[PDB]
RNA sequence: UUUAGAAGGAGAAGUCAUUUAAUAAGGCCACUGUUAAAAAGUGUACCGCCGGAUAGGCGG
């Protein structure tokens, strides 16, 4: 039982779901959190017994699946619908990297082969893995290549002019260009019982809606803390969420 | 119709009247926002709606995700006059919205939507696709001339090697972090290139564009050299790659 | 058991990536390789078109395939009896055939290089090369293979079909295939890349697939020619050409469904798990063929 | 009318690239021709192309590629239509095999009609075909007229026999590459194609840049070769050929010429379904349209 | 004499010093010859030679 | 166990015509570039032989 962190370096994904609710481009972070949880479950199916809790995102390159129409606005592309008309979807080519806060025994020069074997049956936000560049276990603060980290900056999200989120989001968005909208977890309702029609009937069912906040990009050289990134799960009385504290 | 949480928006072919509405208004300045925290000017079983799993610290909970179509209508009019970047989405026809049966979606079936682009020096292009592709020599196939088994043996061919180092990879230099890595497969490459048991003591390893303007660790992009030849080309390549 | 589960989902077992185009000659194929940018033209309109340079003769297309087992790739099943029943059926099919009669045709498709659709007509010579990440394979000429007469007695076809049938059975867990092709058209002729579904308020031209400038093809189209081996549909003896594999047989070329009768997917699953009758080998071939492609196989609740 | 039916064009042309030579060393000389720019008097920038002062001949390089009509049948939504098209094409090729139109196509290359304005004022025009290692005999395009078609040559008959036999019989593709030389003078004004601009506050004259230098459109070099429609009614009075199209008349005259009498929106209801016998000029028009292709629904 | 560095790589061979129609020596070499008198560095007994008086 | 699981964009085209931009014009005046340095790794590698396989070994 020792604390460490693994790095998934330069994972490029085609057709990742970039149309979560309102944000076109960067997907919801719960996609990456559930990807880390699916990797944790895949390693738990094997008898390695290794836990993962904490994930930070480092974006390198992005390609919205489209072009520019006249002046700079984007028009996006889509496949042809078939056997069961198109309604609303978008896709992206991401080239980003993962920091996974890894907590569990027997990590040094181990579990990398298991992660490599179990990664091939995984999709990041519904997109193909293709070829990630490397898996690394270097335990330094300056172990990051030249990328940009998407963190939770609750400064203009919290303190800005405007009475409420709506009359405050766009007003906090004019003066800062790096700051971007981010879907951050999701909670709506109650009645956690066992109503039918579930994907797995032996679980807890709910009717849940996405929630939103702000985010920002900082380089690998200039930074504040590891604790200012590496997003964590959190749970309350029906208010499941992901945050950095 | 006009409810905030209506189905048949993220997908289709889901026969249901799933409307959750909103009788709760908690509009405090928290660290987040929801459909009730917004401006907001305007539920049993599930099939063909997105279902996810979330850990509660202990077990897992299966959660069905409903859209925020009132926020989808409000973002369009908020972004109509705003100056931050925005991405249009013309991925719809009128008959699909008529079949779906939502009056709010019918007025805004081609919405002006929020977006989150990473900064504009991160978007890929032709140079950002050609930097990951590295050149190859146009002659190295087998023992052609001046060569017994891989190594450049005879003389009067190092001008040919110097013009193969030229004529490819000129003016297209990349930064240091935009360079191909040196993998650990290379020891097995010297093992099974021609039949060597290990790295020869009497030979070295070299490429034709070493760490400058292309070059990768392929199965053919290495040419082993002698001491004098490598010593000469270390300055010969730096003569034009100053 | 009486009915299909309320939520059944299958992952696709043949995940292809999008391809990208490059222009090269036929005497300098593996040697050098130029980017094929999408240029623009005047039409009487703003029409995007692509063509080779005046100093090139062929074009080059590279794309990759990933193979996952059908047994393991069950993403969501809301039952245990149905899961064990189809598991037993899959083990029975492995024991009796070994998933080889499907894989031979799945590699017959790439043997004739059907993934270059309008690029095939008028071409001079083809050099489709298939490479796995550990083993290289000999090339073949796509003009010697008919588009209807399949080959079930080749060598490279048999080897690759067996090596992918082990993954289909469940012996391995993944497979990666890299394919390169060198269709020879002529000097400064026209190539035919893919075209997007980007609607526009003002524009009325055709925009082709950019993909960082260097043109290419969608993975949806490049997969469609690798699963067009259905010759077991009814009245096949009056048509003499294969069709792609779907549920209802609704090929977009014709508009009349090829197999909408009881020889289908729903009405064969209703006759396989529940009935457990000795349906012939072609029906089982089709059933595991559509189960390889996968999708959403939930029962029709209302 | 039936479901989605379409076609592909059976003859294909590249985009010709302009050059500039001198007629003394016309085999061994080749110089590029870049589109200049000079403003004209009103705020407006316009481009113009002209030769240099030390040369004398314009050069055009373009190649043709032919496929069979059976191999060019693209979108088939019904097999009754497809087998009717097959039967009509085989009863056409049972006796001549597209021999009427291929000869006129090869003649239309042979006059060098593809230069729309560069033929206005020329001393000598020659046409060379050198696709294989063998060299075809050189041409004399100044000894031809627009209205009449010649039928008794050697190289025209040989090449027309080659395309008319590859149209149905031997092989699927065939490529023939042609090079043309026009003597217009010294440092004169040459006319490449024009580009459809789409920006406001600019009355530009953006000419066509192919591979940087001057060039020619593909739809314009395929509009001169498609002008052979000397079978339409009211031809003896007007006495000029018209480009072949699904409607009646081109945009040159404005008024329609064949809106009802012979047009693919009208006669195909009484051709593909009734299969009644038609005169050979109507069949020539129908397979001229099926040579061009396009949507037919 | 001390060579004239890698000025122009037209001649790959080692050049020499040429000024006023003769050879000689760079006087930076003479300067670093006369500057080698420092025997006050740390761990003098381990190495035991003079070192040129440089910044470090 | 990730707004998870799935998907054929297609065929066809004529952008064309002419056009004078030009008259007039003062870049100015003054401010020390200096401090200090390692190009040279050994800069070229021959015979007498025994050996008759161009194996391999002694001496100058």
Give the integer Cα–Cα distance in Å for D196 and D208. Answer: 10
Nearest to B52 by CA among B44, B60, B43, B63: B63
Q: Are C243 and C228 contacting, i.e. CB atoms less than 8 angstroms apart?
A: yes
Give the integer Cα–Cα distance in Å for C113 and C126. Answer: 8
Dump strand ranges (E) for chain D. 11-13, 17-21, 31-32, 57-66, 125-129, 174-183, 209-210, 213-214
Interchain CB contact of B239 with E (< 8 Å)? yes
Instruction: Report CB contact under 8 Å: C302, B91.
Output: no
Give the integer Cα–Cα distance in Å for A62 and A55. Answer: 20
Q: Are A25 and B116 contacting, i.e. CB atoms less than 8 angstroms apart?
A: yes
Nearest to A136 by CA among A103, A106, A99: A99
B101-107: long-range pairs with CB below 8 Å, 24+: B101/B1, B101/B8, B102/B1, B102/B6, B102/B8, B102/B9, B102/B69, B103/B1, B103/B2, B104/B2, B104/B42, B104/B69, B104/B70, B104/B73, B105/B9, B105/B69, B105/B72, B107/B73
Residue A151: φ, ψ to 5°: -110, 180
**Alpha carbons within 13 A on the beta-carbon side of A26:** 30
Give the integer Cα–Cα distance in Å for B31 and A192. Answer: 25
What is the SS3 assignment for C258? Answer: coil
Q: Which nucleotide is closest to the Cα of B67 by its C1'?
A: F3
Residue D97: left (phi > 0), alpha (psi -120 to 50), or beta?
A: left
DSSP state of B118: P
State the CB neighbour count (10 A cutoff) for residue B13: 11
Nearest to A185 by CA among B78, B55, B73: B55
Q: Which nucleotide is closest to the Cα of C42 by its C1'?
A: F15
**What sign does the dihedral B35-B36-B38-B39 (CA atoms) show?**
positive
DSSP state of A98: E
End-to-end CA distance of chain B: 69
Give the integer Cα–Cα distance in Å for C247 and C265. Answer: 5
Give the integer Cα–Cα distance in Å for B3 and C92. Answer: 51
What is the SS3 assignment for D99? Answer: helix
For residue C236, give every residue at least 6 positions away whose Cβ sits within 8 Å of its Cβ, in sequence order, or none. none
Q: Which two tokens stand for residue C83?
A: 């899961």
- Name the packing angle between helices D280-292 and D99-110 (round to 10°): 60
What is the SS3 assignment for D13? Answer: strand
Q: Which member of B79, B92, B118 has the closest CB to residue A88?
A: B92
Q: Are B220 and B136 contacting, i.e. CB atoms less than 8 angstroms apart?
A: yes
Give the integer Cα–Cα distance in Å for A16 and A8. Answer: 17
Give the integer Cα–Cα distance in Å for A59 and A178. Answer: 13
Nearest to A39 by CA among A57, A54, A51: A51
Nearest to A21 by CA among B72, B4, B53, B6: B72
Strand partners, A145: none
Give the integer Cα–Cα distance in Å for C240 and C149. Answer: 9
Give the integer Cα–Cα distance in Å for E34 and D99. Answer: 100
Which H or E run contains C130?
A: strand C129-132
Give the integer Cα–Cα distance in Å for C264 and C234. Answer: 10
- Name the packing angle between helices C156-169 and C100-111 (round to 10°): 130
**What sign does the dihedral D18-D22-D26-D32 (CA atoms) show?**
negative
D29-63 burial: b if 16+ Cβ within 10 Å, else e: eeeebebeeeeeeeeeeebebebeeebbbbbbbbb
Give the integer Cα–Cα distance in Å for B114 and B38. Answer: 14
Give the integer Cα–Cα distance in Å for C156 and C137. Answer: 7
Q: Are C4 and C298 contacting, i.e. CB atoms less than 8 angstroms apart?
A: yes
Q: Which member of C51, C186, C253 has the closest CB to residue D175?
A: C186
Q: Which member of D17, D67, D195 has the closest CB to residue C54?
A: D17
Residue D201: left (phi > 0), alpha (psi -120 to 50), or beta?
A: left
For residue D40, give every residue at least 6 positions away whose Cβ sits within 8 Å of its Cβ, in sequence order, or none. D46
Q: Which two tokens stand for residue D104?
A: 């006129």
Give the integer Cα–Cα distance in Å for D238 and D235. Answer: 5
Nearest to B230 by CA among B162, B179, B181, B168: B162
Sequence-ordered alpha helix ranges (H) in chain B: 69-80, 94-100, 103-107, 126-130, 158-165, 186-192, 227-240
Give the integer Cα–Cα distance in Å for B80 and B111. Answer: 10
State the CB neighbour count (10 A cutoff) for residue D93: 19
Q: Give me the total of CB pairs closer than 8 Å, taking one residue from chain A and one from chain C.
A: 63
Strand partners, C47: C41
Give the integer Cα–Cα distance in Å for A217 and D90. Answer: 68
Residue in this structure with the two tokens 């240029």, named with its chain if needed: C39
Contact list, C54 vs chain D (CB under 8 Å) = 17, 61, 211
How far in angstroms lies nucleotide F55's C1' from the CA of residue B195?
Answer: 23
Method of determination? Answer: cryo-EM
Contact list, C302 vs chain B (CB under 8 Å) = 15
Burial class of residue B60 in the structure, from the number of CB atoms within 10 Å of its CB (0-12 exposed, 13-18 middle, 19+ buried): middle
For residue E53, give every residue at least 6 positions away whose Cβ sits within 8 Å of its Cβ, in sequence order, or none. E35, E36, E37, E38
Is chain B touching chain C, with at least 3 CB–CB pairs below 8 Å?
yes
State the CB neighbour count (10 A cutoff) for residue C222: 23
Q: Are D10 and D293 contacting, i.e. CB atoms less than 8 angstroms apart?
A: yes
End-to-end CA distance of chain E: 28
B223-228: long-range pairs with CB below 8 Å, 24+: B223/B137, B223/B140, B223/B152, B223/B161, B224/B150, B224/B151, B224/B152, B224/B200, B225/B151, B225/B152, B226/B151, B226/B152
Q: Are C221 and C208 contacting, i.e. CB atoms less than 8 angstroms apart?
A: no
Q: Which two tokens stand for residue A53?
A: 């809790």
Q: Which two tokens stand for residue D5?
A: 């039916």
DSSP state of A160: -
Give the integer Cα–Cα distance in Å for D45 and C37. Answer: 28
Q: Are A213 and A151 contacting, i.e. CB atoms less than 8 angstroms apart?
A: no
Q: Which nucleotide is closest to the Cα of E2 by its C1'?
A: F39
Q: Which nucleotide is closest to the Cα of B64 by its C1'?
A: F3
Q: Which two tokens stand for residue C43?
A: 């039409």
DSSP B22-39: ---------SSB-TTTS-
| Three-class HEC string of D129-188 | ECCCCCCCCCCCHHHCCCCCCCCCCCHHHHHHHHHHHHCCCCCCCEEEEEEEEEECCCCC
Which H or E run contains E52?
A: strand E51-52
Which H or E run contains B61?
A: strand B60-66
State the CB neighbour count (10 A cutoff) for residue B151: 17
End-to-end CA distance of chain A: 23
Q: Are C244 and C227 contacting, i.e. CB atoms less than 8 angstroms apart?
A: yes
Nucleotides of F under 7 A from a protein CB: 1-17, 19-21, 36-40, 43-45
Give the integer Cα–Cα distance in Å for D291 and D108. Answer: 15
Contact list, D61 vs chain C (CB under 8 Å) = 54
What Å distances lie between residue B32 and A157, B68, C136, D159, CA to CA?
Answer: 8, 15, 54, 76
Residue A194: φ, ψ to 5°: -115, 50
Interchain CB contact of B50 with C (< 8 Å)? no
Instruction: Report CB contact under 8 Å: B232, E9.
Output: no
Give the integer Cα–Cα distance in Å for A39 and A98. Answer: 13
Beta strand B87-88 with B112-113 is antiparallel
Nearest to C8 by CA among C83, C78, C70: C78
Nearest to D185 by CA among D20, D37, D33, D31: D20
Q: Which member of C43, C121, C188 has the closest CB to residue D219?
A: C43
Count, residues in chain A? 245
How far in angstroms lies nucleotide F50's C1' from the CA of residue B153?
Answer: 30
Please give, rounded to a whole number of angstroms, the shortest distance from the CA of B173 to a CA of chain A: 18
Q: Which two tokens stand for residue B140?
A: 């190295």
Q: Which two tokens stand for residue D82?
A: 């497809």
Angstrom resolution of this structure: 3.3
Dump strand ranges (E) for chain A. 3-17, 24-25, 51-59, 62-64, 66-68, 74-76, 91-103, 134-136, 148-151, 180-186, 205-219, 232-234, 241-243
Sequence-ordered alpha helix ranges (H) in D1-135: 79-93, 99-110
**What sign does the dihedral C269-C270-C275-C279 (CA atoms) show?**
negative
How far in angstroms lies nucleotide F46's C1' from the CA of residue E19?
Answer: 37
Q: Which two tokens stand for residue B22?
A: 């909103």
Strand partners, A217: A150
Give the integer Cα–Cα distance in Å for D38 and D44. Answer: 10
Give the integer Cα–Cα distance in Å for D124 and D112. Answer: 11
């Amino acid at each position: 039982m020792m604390k460490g962190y693994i790095l998934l370096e330069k994972v490029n994904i085609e057709n990742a779901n970039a149309f979560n609710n309102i944000i076109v481009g960067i997907p919801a972070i719960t996609s990456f959190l559930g990807f880390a949880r699916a990797l944790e479950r895949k390693l738990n199916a094997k008898e390695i017994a290794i836990r993962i809790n904490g994930v930070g995102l480092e974006f390198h390159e992005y390609e919205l699946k489209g072009y520019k129409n006249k002046r700079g606005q984007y028009v996006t592309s889509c496949p042809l619908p078939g056997s069961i008309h198109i309604m609303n979807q978008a896709y992206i080519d991401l080239n980003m990297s993962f920091l996974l806060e890894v907590e569990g025994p027997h990590v040094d020069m181990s579990t990398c082969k298991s992660i490599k074997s179990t990664m091939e049956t995984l999709r990041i936000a519904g997109g193909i893995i293709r070829n990630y560049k490397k898996i690394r276990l270097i335990d330094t603060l300056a172990d990051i290549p030249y990328g940009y980290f998407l963190t939770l900056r609750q400064d203009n999200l919290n303190d800005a002019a405007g009475d409420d989120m709506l009359d405050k989001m766009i007003h906090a968005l004019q003066q800062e260009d790096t700051l971007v909208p981010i879907a951050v977890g999701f909670k709506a309702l109650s009645e956690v019982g066992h109503v039918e029609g579930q994907r797995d009937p032996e679980k807890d069912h709910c009717f849940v809606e996405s929630i939103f906040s702000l985010g920002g990009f900082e380089c690998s050289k200039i930074l504040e803390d590891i604790n200012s990134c590496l997003w964590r799960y959190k749970t309350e009385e029906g208010l499941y969420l992901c945050t950095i504290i | 119709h006009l409810a905030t949480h209506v189905a048949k928006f993220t997908e289709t072919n889901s026969p249901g009247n799933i409307g959750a509405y909103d009788i709760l208004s908690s509009d405090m300045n928290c660290g987040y926002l929801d459909t009730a925290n917004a401006g907001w000017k305007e539920y049993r079983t599930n099939q063909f709606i997105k279902q996810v799993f979330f850990p509660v610290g202990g077990s897992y909970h299966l959660l069905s995700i409903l859209p925020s179509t009132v926020l989808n209508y409000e973002v369009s009019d908020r972004l109509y006059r705003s100056k931050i970047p925005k991405i249009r989405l013309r991925l719809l026809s009128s008959n699909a919205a008529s079949t779906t049966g939502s009056r709010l979606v019918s007025k805004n079936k081609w919405p002006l939507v929020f977006q989150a682009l990473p900064p504009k020096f991160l978007e890929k292009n032709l140079a950002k696709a050609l930097d990951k592709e590295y050149l190859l020599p146009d002659i190295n196939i087998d023992e052609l001339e001046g060569v017994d088994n891989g190594c450049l043996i005879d003389e009067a061919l190092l001008p040919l090697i110097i013009d193969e180092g030229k004529r490819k990879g000129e003016g297209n230099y990349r930064p240091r972090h935009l360079r191909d890595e040196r993998k650990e497969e290379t020891v097995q490459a010297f093992l099974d290139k021609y039949g060597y048991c290990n790295i020869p003591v009497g030979y070295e390893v070299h490429h034709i564009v070493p760490l400058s303007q292309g070059g990768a660790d392929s199965i053919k992009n290495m040419i082993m050299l002698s001491i004098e030849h490598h010593e000469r080309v270390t300055e010969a390549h730096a003569s034009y790659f100053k | 058991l009486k009915s299909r589960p309320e939520n059944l989902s299958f992952a696709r077992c043949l995940n292809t990536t999008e391809a990208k185009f490059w222009q090269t000659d036929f005497l300098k194929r593996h040697t050098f390789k130029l980017p094929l940018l999408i240029t623009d033209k005047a039409v009487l309109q703003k029409s995007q078109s692509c063509t080779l340079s005046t100093e090139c003769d062929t074009l080059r297309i590279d794309f990759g395939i990933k193979v996952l087992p059908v047994k393991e790739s069950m993403y969501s099943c809301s039952d245990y009896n149905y899961r064990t029943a189809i598991y037993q059926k899959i083990d029975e099919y492995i024991a009796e055939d070994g998933f080889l009669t499907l894989a031979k045709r799945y590699v017959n498709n790439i043997a004739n290089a059907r993934f270059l659709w309008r690029n095939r007509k008028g071409a001079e010579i083809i050099e489709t090369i298939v490479t796995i990440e550990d083993k290289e394979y000999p090339s073949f000429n796509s003009k010697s293979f008919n588009l209807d007469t399949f080959v079930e007695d080749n060598a490279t076809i048999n080897e690759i079909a067996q090596q992918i049938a082990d993954t289909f059975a469940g012996k391995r867990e993944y497979l990666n295939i890299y394919v390169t092709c060198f269709v020879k058209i002529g000097c400064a002729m026209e190539v035919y890349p893919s075209q997007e579904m980007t609607f526009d308020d003002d524009d009325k031209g055709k925009k082709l697939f950019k993909f960082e400038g260097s043109a290419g093809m969608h993975s949806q189209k490049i997969n469609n020619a690798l699963r067009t081996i259905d010759t077991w549909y009814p009245d096949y003896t009056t048509y003499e050409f294969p069709i792609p594999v779907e549920n209802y047989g609704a090929a977009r070329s014709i508009g009349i469904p090829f197999r909408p009768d009881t020889k289908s997917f729903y009405k064969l699953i209703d006759r396989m798990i529940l009935k457990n009758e000795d349906l012939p080998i072609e029906d089982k071939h089709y059933v595991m063929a559509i189960l390889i492609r996968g999708g959403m196989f939930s029962k029709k609740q209302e």
